[PDB]
Every structure is written in structure tokens, then in C-alpha cells.
Subunit: 364 residues, 4 copies
């Protein structure tokens, strides 16, 4: 039980003879690899990701995105002026974790990013800015500060800046999962967006964003949320109410001074998309979360306030827009200096769907 | 296939002899009843309810409720000054249909209706009035015009009029189902309500009424909705948006000029309670719905405007507050003279859960 | 909490005046019934069925069925020479409980019972006999001692005696539920059965009765089991193995000396049909089950051995073939004198689907 | 729509200036990778696995396994004398596909392989041999020709040869998925097996292998099958019956002359384990399956008879024991020369759980 791969007796060490070396040589020629030389690496005691905890500064991401807006035109082929966060441990792949892409995207004055679709699921999140509409299956969706915008797999999407000012946001996708697992399909759509209109609220929201109500034309459940925009207003109100209810001595917050919501598919009560979980957390000044180990990877973006993250015992100070990744089973906690708002995403739906999820919480 | 119980050959007619009569007599003594004398009644070609279509006028219901407020005190024992709509076909039982109670309730100035709970599921709907709070598991819930209020089975509930003016509403319960099926439990609670405070919005709403958002403290799914109030604002907005989207040529309405929503449990996307489905319909002036036959019973209350219902080919003119029941498989349609808003409930979740549901729609 | 409808203060007793009597008279004229005169009956503290516990002797059921085979021809119209057990508490209805029909059926030498279908779900169980095939959607299904045969709602079924000797079995249906709830449809099929062949095993069994295996042509889940026959061999083997595993000190039996199985839909792991649960119990000699209160009704048939049932504290000695009903919430236990085998059915799937199920077990 | 990554206009080619090269250099320093240089590789038109179709000959696998039994002792540390099939396209990883390990394992006379558990799900399949018991959570499970044995994640398992003759089998696991996704946990158990007894049938089978029957002590559904052994008898009988039913003109086979089953979890009707689907196929002599493209990877082992596989248009002749892998979206078909039996496994449950599954069938 307490034994690990370092301390266990190694009882399968063959005698090193010419017959043994010839056996190993013939394994190579036959595309055979023995378990007994490999076991501890293939099957660790607990997860040990090649990805490392890492933090990217928003100020740095903005500088690089802005310079890219100056030097690189957006359009067909390359599709998006998007910069992926590449984990230092992941071999030069544009993967923030083994399952997820997280990237900054920049659309300059009056630019269009052309329409396409792909089996890969996607969302947009906005720490700051306005001006862009993303048109999802023909339905123009305004992008504003604090909004989560969804683009489920196989939905046509294109983006356009309707103003004379640049805008930046983050993209999350299951690109790394999808590449390694061979589930990717892609289709080019129109070179412009199919609708340039700029309504305040999308058709999706107009049908689906009334609490506890479901259109009779929408009684079929969906694999992904039909809500195209989870607007900041509602997120802000939800979190405030939780802290207000806590004041009044009423259950609501997930832990003391820790308000939090999960963005959900309203047809099921489940996650927004099959591979991706999105959450939003608001911590009271002075709140320190209990340290968690969780299977699978998570990424946060600081939306507002000041604080720190601790990963593997290491404290990193965080500011507005900063992004960090916690790989599988890395102990993590957040510490709020001011009231501390963060946007969160993860691959937890994959882990939970396949019964791989485990959680260790300090004090429990 | 085209044969029915009237036209089929009756091939089990025994010879009427003293031996046969002695056999039938001994069936009675042994508590045995033969199928062959009974078949057509026990197993009809299509449903043939003992309940009949029937309409009750709100003006009449109000008169009787008001007089009851003058002559009958509310309190313990009797519990509620509630008048049940009793279907003429249902043998003197206080059943609007074989599954459902529908009733008018009246609470006068400053009165309290004391706390209790029961396995029977319940909701309140308000065509008109204000002043009452219903306190559900200690959580005061304001009752206003156009609101649906829920009281799932086994939740403690009491009601109090916080003003000097009377209020009336309708109650729906699965009382008849629960009586006939032997599932009823009941417990007396406090003689007053446990909280006299009168907040604008309940704790339940404050956690659960933000579209597409779920508290992390509420990740467990519930058998009934945790939303205690489905406020008129949202219902009205939903219905308007559907008619607006229809104008713009966009799918939304369930049929031409027919906007409609289903009130739902946000943890599942399903019905508010296991036995009871609630809906709200808004018809454009001049809309006539396609005639439907549906398994199980439904009840409507006219919330606003003027129109008619047709049941079994018979037109009945309807006004604000009027209530009608459509028993199982009775052909029904609605005709809007002005824009015509109706609140709807039914036992459809029971039928659908047990795979008994069938639907015939005229033109399909 | 400890108050009941007998001991609670009755605080809604109006003054008995001509104005009050005129109010009550006008309730009658308007088809209105007040809650306050009715409450305790409509909403009891715990279930109080109109059905009573009752036992029918197989010797008596056989005598009556045999005499019916002499005096009453089987055929069209009457459809089946079936005798329903009619609960003394259920008003002359051919209902063994408020939800279920339980009946003895008799098919004499060479007789055919013609084909039909109905939304009502059905099963056959055989304490004794052979010779009959029931043809279900064209698929001949042999009927033998100890077999459970299924006939899910809307499946065409007819029965024929292929021998010169009579056979009797029991039928269970959701007839009473279906009548009271208005879900019944019925269709006459062919006057004879569509296939007179008499294979040992049906096509359904040949596809579906291999443990842990599912045909690739059957990947769609079904609302009812596609297994047409649950043969005695497997039931007997299952129960024996549980008692053997218990001997070996291994978990298997549901309680000490109490082996039991539930017949299941193999596509879901759930109940055989939406309204009806079937089980088979085998008790070691000397086993006495802990007393249970359960919501909803259950019926047993003694298949073999000798024992007793206790209901409401009353012991009734039982022999092979005897049948008894336990209405909702009646305390019940079984006592085995010899090894005691019983077939069981109930309306528990209805109760569980609608979250009405409760269970009290003595000692827990 | 018809455009691909080769033929699309590349409109994001920046001017190659020192400012651009400095921008790209600073991307490297900041752990940023741009989408626009990467798009076509990250997001292909359809899947394009690094894994290639490949076939391994059983004669070759046996030779290498036998020599390993001579030169390499089995025991602690290395754990298993197992040889993994390593796809030539997968970079030297011991992965037959991106999701699955498939390997030959060899246990010589009287040897024990010691107990352990791991989150990785596993099964054993036997083309030939007898003598080994695998003890799963203390429950000895006989291993015989044609049997599928399961070892769901986190179950303690060890293996022992109870005879004087060697035995070989194949192992399938979700090792590659689990490594790349960081879900692996591992625990060492006892150095020997905890029970050396050698019963014909395990406790799991004795509870769970009776068709359509479920123990009342097992009403809780499981994430993986509780059946530890899917014995050849039942698999053989199922397949025969399908071909017999086809002869009789009755629906059963999945395609003409193509009998097939899926091994299932009896508590749900679903797959044996969350990550792994197992099937068994029997083709009539002369049957050629319609060509399929399927998302995700599959592996077959020829159990009996002679035939061929076609992958990417290439025919490879197959004999008893031979193994082949079809990576994601590779067109594949089987051709039977004699009656042709194959065991199949795949990662299809992962694809279906996450809504990534697509299927193209030739002629449909
Ligand atoms: O569609 C996008 O905006 C996008 C952004 C980043 C990565 C892949 C994408 O398709
Ligand atoms: O609780 C109520 O207000 C009520 C109203 C009508 C019928 C039964 C009830 O419990
Ligand atoms: O089909 C039958 O055999 C039957 C038996 C009893 C009651 C109703 C029925 O349809
Ligand atoms: O337990 C096994 O036999 C085994 C076999 C191959 C790979 C990993 C394993 O744990
Ligand atoms: Fe995209
Ligand atoms: Fe009540
Ligand atoms: Fe019938
Ligand atoms: Fe293992």
C-alpha cells in the first residue's frame, strides 16, 4: 500500500546475456514493447503530468497580441489571430494542458474573421473590451466585458469588429484532446460573416435566457447549451446574492466567503459542452481556499481584484487578466487580497463522464 | 382493427342454466369477478373518462370564495379556505379530473393559514391580486399577479396575508391521484408561519433565478424544482420574445401565432414536479389551435384577453379567470379573439413517465 | 408532529346559519366542494387504502376456473376465460388492488384465445401445468411451470392449448390503474393465433437470453423487456446460487436465509414493464422476514413449500398456489415452515417513478 | 465546403521583416504559439491519426512471448510478463492506438503474477489455452479459450497458473488514454494472490450470469460490469442463434451473414467499462462487410477461421490469433473465407460519451 515505483522490489530483471539482447532486438523489429521495462512510467502511483503549473501575465499577452495586430493580417487559411498558451512541459505543442487550448485572440478595427466549423468545442471569455460580434450559426452574438460566449462543436462561427477600436478576448477549446484522440473534423464556411447586424442580444438568449422557462419549440434536450451568451449582468448578480445570503446566515456559498457558479446547459442542468466545464468564482477579501488535488486540468483567468494562487506550495501574485493552469492532481489554492473574481474552465466533464474523477480537499 | 366493443361478436355467452347461475353466485361469495362479462368497460378502444369537459366562471368562483371568507374562519383542522372544482362525472369526489385537484383559495385581511406538509405535490397560480406570502420550508415567497409558486411534496408550507385587503389564487395538486393510489402522508407544522418577513424575492429565487447559472453549492439534481416562484416578468418577457422572433421570421413559437413556455426544474430541464406539468400559452388575436387529442387530463386558467375553447366540438366563450378541464383524449382547441393568455397544468408527467402518452393533432 | 386528524383542533367550523346552508347549497349547484369539510379524508397522515389485505386459496380458484371451463366457452368479445381477484374493499371493481388486476385464467384442451392488443401491460405466471403457447407479436412462447411470460402494452397476443389437457395460470395487469387514469386503448387482432408452431424457445429468448450479451441489431433501449419468457431453470439456479454463496459466507442473499431476484429489462437493468415489478423469493425453512411497510400494493403467489403471511399482525397459513395482496403501507412479513418459494408482483415502478416510494423496515 | 488545408487561400502570411522575426522570437520566450502557423495540423478536415493500420501475426507474438517466458522471470516491480503492441506511428510509445494498450501476456507453469490495482480499466481475452485463474477483488476467475475476463479500474487483480503447462492471452487497457490524460493511480497489493482456490465459476458469475435476473442485493447500478467472465459457451450460443434466426427469415444478424454481439454491463445495458467496448463477430463464409469509417480506434483478434481485413484499400490475409488495429476514420472491412470469428475492442465509449462519434458506411 505504501510502496511506490522507487521503493518496490524489481523482480523482473533478466540476466543480461546475448540471448536476452537478441530477444530485445527482435521486440524492436516486431513493434513490440515489454511492460516490465516500462511499468512505473505507464502506470504511476498518482497522476504526474508532463504539463507544469504556469502563469502568464495579461500585460505580456496584450503586448504580444497588439504587436500581432500590427504585423499579421487576419483571414482565411490561418483563420484567427489567436495566440495559444503553450505549456513548457508539453514538448512544443500549442497545448496549455493535455486536454485544452487557452489562447488570447485579437481583432482590430473593422476586421472580419471568416466563418468555419469544427468538431472541437469552443468558448470565448472577455476580461475587457467591446465592439466584436461573433456570429454563431447565423445568429449575431455581442461580445462584452465579463461575458462567456459559447461555440459548441460543429456550429458555424465567424467574428467581426463593428467599431474603430481593437478588441481582445480569450478562447478555450478541446483542441489538444481532439488532436491526440483523433476526433477532429473541420469545414470552411463563408469568407465574411453571414450577418453583419449588431443586435444587443442574440436569438438564442431571447429564447433561452428566462430563468426556469423553456420554449415548447425546444423540448428536445441538447448535447451542448443553446445559450450563446452568458452575460456579465447575471453572473455578477448571482455571485452578489450568494454573498448576501451568506451575510443573512443562509446556505448559498460553496465555502466561507467563496461564492461560485457553474455555467450550465439549460436543457439538462449539466455542463455547457461535453468536454469543457466553465465556472466563475468570487472570493471575499482575505478568503483562502482549502487546498485541492483534482484529476484533470483547469485554467483560470483573473477577471478582477488582486490575489495569489498557490500551486505545489508556490505562491504567485496575480493581477487582472492573468492566466494560470493547474495540471492534473497538482495541489492548488487561491488567496484573495481584495475581493477576487476569476473565470474558470476545465476538462472535468471528460474525467467525470469516464469515472476517472478524484478530489482531495485539505481538512476533509 | 375497425371492430369495437359494440360491433364485435360476443362468443363467450354461456347457456343460462341453474349451474351457470350457481357458478356466478359462487364467484360473488369468493370475491371473484369474470373478465368476460366486463371486458369492454375495463379495456376500452380509446380512453373514455368518467370526467366530463367542464368550465367554471371566475365571476362565480369569486362570489363563492368571497362569501366563504365572510362565513368560514380559516385555521387548523380544515387548514385552508379552498374550494375544489368537482367534476360532474366523478361521483361527488372533489376531483377536477381523475388525477388533479384544482381549486380557488381565499385569504382575507391579516389572516394566517397554518403550516403543514404532505406527500401531495402542489403549486399556486395568481390571475389577480397581491398581499399574500407563502412560506415554504421557512422561505417567505411573495405571491403576485401572474406568478406561479411551487410547493413540492413534503415541503412545509403556510400562507399569510400581510395587508388589509383579501387575496384569491388557484391551487393545483395531485390529490386525486394520491388518494386513489394510496401515496398520501401528512404532517401538521406550526400553527402560525415560521417567518413573517415579507421580502420581494425568496432565497430560492436568489440562488436559482439567474439564466444558465447554477450555484456550486447546488450540484445535486432535485426531483422537483428548487425555484419557489416563477415571476410574471419572465413569463411575459419569454412570450413576447417568441412573438417578436416570429415577426422577424425566426423559429420560436410552437405553432403560428402561438407562443408558449413550460415551467421547468432548472437542475434537470424537466417538469416542475413529478406528477404535474405547468405551461403558459399566449395566442395572437385570431389564432385557432389545431385540434388535439392527448392522453391524460389538463386544466387551463384564462389569465388575460378573450377567446373560446372547443371541447368535443362544443364552443364555450371564455373570459379572464375562467377555468376549464379537458379529460383524457377529449378533442380540444383554443380560439383567440383578442391576444389570449392562459395558464396550463396537467398530469402529463405521469403519462410520459409510464409510457402511456399518445397525441393526435389535426392536420398531422 | 404527533397530531393526527382525530386529535387536531378543528378551527374551521362555521356557525350553522341559514346563510351558511345557502352557501353550501350553492357549492353543490356550482360543482364546488370545500376542502375544510374533507381534509382528513383527502390527505391522510399515512396511506389508508380502501383495499384490504386478503388471501385467495388456490384450491378454490382452481375449482371455479375448472367449472368455468365446463360452462363458459372462450372466444371473441369476452376474449379470455379469466377470473379477476376482486378486493372486498374496492366497491365491486374487479381490482385486486387500486393499481393491479390479478386473475386466474383457464384454457381447456385444444382451445384458442384470439389475438388482441391494449395499452395495458401484462404478464403471465405459471405455478403449474404445461401445454399452452402464447403468441406475442407473432412469436410463439411456450408456457411452463415456474415461467414468467411478458406481454408489454401494445403487443399483439393470443394463446392456444396445443394438447388434450387443460392449463391454468395467473395474469397480472395494470388494468385498475389504466381504467382510473384513462390511458386504455384496445385493438382486436386475428380470431385465431397467427402462428400455431410450438417451438421450445421463442425468438425473443434466442436473441436475448444469453447472460451479459446484447445483439448488435438491438442497441436501442426498450421501455419494456424484449425477453418474452423468464424460464424456471434460470430463476431456480439464481436462487440456489444465492443460498450456496450464503453458505460459503459470501454476500448474495438480500437478508439471512432470504434469496431473491428481480426480473429485469436487459436493455436497461430496470423493471420488466413501466407499471409492473416482478420478483421471485426463496426463503430457507424457519426464515421470518423483518416486517415491512411499503408504499403501493404488492401481490404474491406461493409457488412451492409451506408457510404463512402476516399482514396487520394477522397470520394466515399458506399453501402452493395461494395468492395474497398487501395494500399500500400495510405491515407485512413472510414466515417459512419448509423452504418457501413465492412469485411477487407490484406497482412499485409507478411509485418510484413519481418519487412517492417510502419503506419502513422493522429493526431499521 | 470542398476546400481543404492544401487548397485554401493562406491570407495570414505576414511580411518577413526583422520586426516579425523579433515578434516570433518573443513568442518562444513567452511560451506562446500562434494559431495561424499551425491551423491545418491542429484542426484537420477529418481525422488523420499518427497511428497507422497494422497487423501482428499470432505466430510471431507466441514466439516472442515463449522466449520471454524462458528469459524473463515474472514478479513484483515489472508486475506482468506482458508485451504491448506498439503502433509504428506512435513515436516509440507502447500504444497500439492513441487510447489503448493491446498486448500478449504469458504465464508459465505454476507461476503467480502478484496483486495490484490501478485506475486503468482492463480486460483479458483468450484465443487459446487453459490453466490460469485471475483473482479479482478476492474472487478467483477461471480463464479459458474464448472467454472475456474483466478487470474494471481500481479492482485488485493477480493471476496464477494452476497447472504444469504455460498459458497466453491478450490484455486490453486504456493505458495510453490514461497516461496522456493524467488519470492514472496505482497501488501494489499482496505479493501472491489472496485465494489459490480454482472454482469452475466465479462468485460474480454465480450472482450475475442468469439471463434477465438481478439479485435484490444488487439493485444499485455500477459504472462497470460486475460480470467477471463472459464465457465462450454463451458467446458461441448467441452467435449461432443469430445465424439460425437469419436462416428462418427472422431479424437478428446485424447485416447479411454477419452475426455479432456486444458484451454488456447487466446493471445498465451499456458497455462493460467506461472507456472500452468489447464485441464478438461471426461472419458466414463468403461474407464481406460494407466498408466503415468510424471515429476512434478499434482492435480485433481473429479467434477462428480464415479471412482477410481491408484497411485503406489494402488486403491483409488473416489467421487464428492474428491482431490488427484500425485507427480513427480509416476505411475498414472484413472478408470471410471460412466462417470467421473475431473478438473486438475499441475506445468507442469515450467517443460516444463526448459526442465525437461519426460513422460512414459504404452504401448508406
Ligand atoms: O474560432 C476561433 O476563434 C478559434 C480560436 C482559437 C483556436 C481555434 C479557433 O477555431
Ligand atoms: O396548502 C394548501 O394551500 C392547499 C390548498 C388546496 C388543497 C390542499 C392544500 O394543502
Ligand atoms: O390477454 C389476456 O390473457 C388477459 C388476461 C386477463 C385480463 C386481460 C387480458 O388481456
Ligand atoms: O494486470 C495485468 O495483467 C496487466 C497487463 C498488461 C498491462 C497492464 C496490466 O496491469
Ligand atoms: Fe473556430
Ligand atoms: Fe398544503
Ligand atoms: Fe390481453
Ligand atoms: Fe493490472
Amino acid at each position: 500500500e505504501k510502496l511506490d515505483h522507487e521503493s518496490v522490489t524489481q523482480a523482473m530483471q533478466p540476466k543480461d546475456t546475448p540471448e536476452l539482447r537478441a530477444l530485445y532486438k527482435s521486440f524492436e523489429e516486431e513493434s513490440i514493447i515489454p511492460l516490465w521495462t516500462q511499468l512505473g512510467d505507464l502506470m504511476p502511483i498518482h497522476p504526474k503530468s508532463k504539463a507544469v503549473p504556469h502563469v502568464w501575465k495579461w500585460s505580456t499577452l496584450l503586448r504580444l497580441a497588439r504587436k500581432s495586430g500590427e504585423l499579421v493580417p487576419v483571414g482565411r487559411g490561418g483563420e484567427r489571430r489567436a495566440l495559444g498558451l503553450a505549456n513548457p512541459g508539453l514538448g512544443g505543442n500549442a497545448y496549455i494542458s493535455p486536454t485544452m487550448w487557452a489562447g488570447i485572440q485579437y481583432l482590430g478595427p473593422r476586421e472580419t474573421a471568416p466563418e468555419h466549423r469544427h468538431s472541437q468545442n469552443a468558448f470565448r471569455f472577455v476580461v475587457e473590451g467591446e465592439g466584436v460580434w461573433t456570429v454563431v450559426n447565423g445568429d449575431p452574438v455581442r461580445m462584452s466585458r465579463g461575458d462567456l460566449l459559447l461555440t459548441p462543436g460543429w456550429c458555424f462561427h465567424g467574428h467581426m469588429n463593428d467599431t474603430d477600436q481593437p478588441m481582445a478576448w480569450i478562447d478555450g477549446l478541446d483542441i489538444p484532446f481532439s488532436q491526440q484522440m483523433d476526433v477532429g473534423f473541420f469545414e470552411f464556411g463563408s469568407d465574411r460573416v453571414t450577418d453583419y447586424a449588431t443586435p444587443n442580444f442574440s436569438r438564442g438568449e431571447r429564447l433561452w435566457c428566462h430563468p426556469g422557462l423553456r420554449p415548447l419549440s425546444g423540448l428536445q434536450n441538447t448535447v451542448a447549451s443553446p445559450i450563446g451568451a452568458y452575460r456579465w449582468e447575471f453572473t455578477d448578480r448571482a455571485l452578489t446574492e450568494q454573498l448576501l445570503l451568506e451575510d443573512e446566515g443562509q446556505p448559498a456559498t460553496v465555502a466561507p466567503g467563496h461564492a461560485a457558479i457553474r455555467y450550465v446547459n439549460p436543457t439538462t442542468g449539466g455542463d455547457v459542452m461535453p468536454t469543457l466545464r466553465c465556472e466563475f468564482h468570487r472570493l471575499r477579501a482575505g478568503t483562502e481556499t482549502a487546498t485541492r488535488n483534482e484529476v484533470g486540468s483547469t485554467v483560470f483567468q483573473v477577471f478582477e481584484g488582486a490575489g495569489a494562487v498557490v500551486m505545489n506550495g508556490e505562491t504567485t501574485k496575480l493581477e487582472k487578466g492573468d492566466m494560470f493552469v493547474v495540471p492534473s492532481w497538482v495541489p492548488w489554492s487561491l488567496q484573495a487580497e481584495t475581493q477576487f473574481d476569476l473565470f474558470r474552465f476545465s476538462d472535468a466533464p471528460i474525467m467525470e463522464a469516464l469515472s476517472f474523477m478524484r478530489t482531495k480537499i485539505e481538512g476533509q
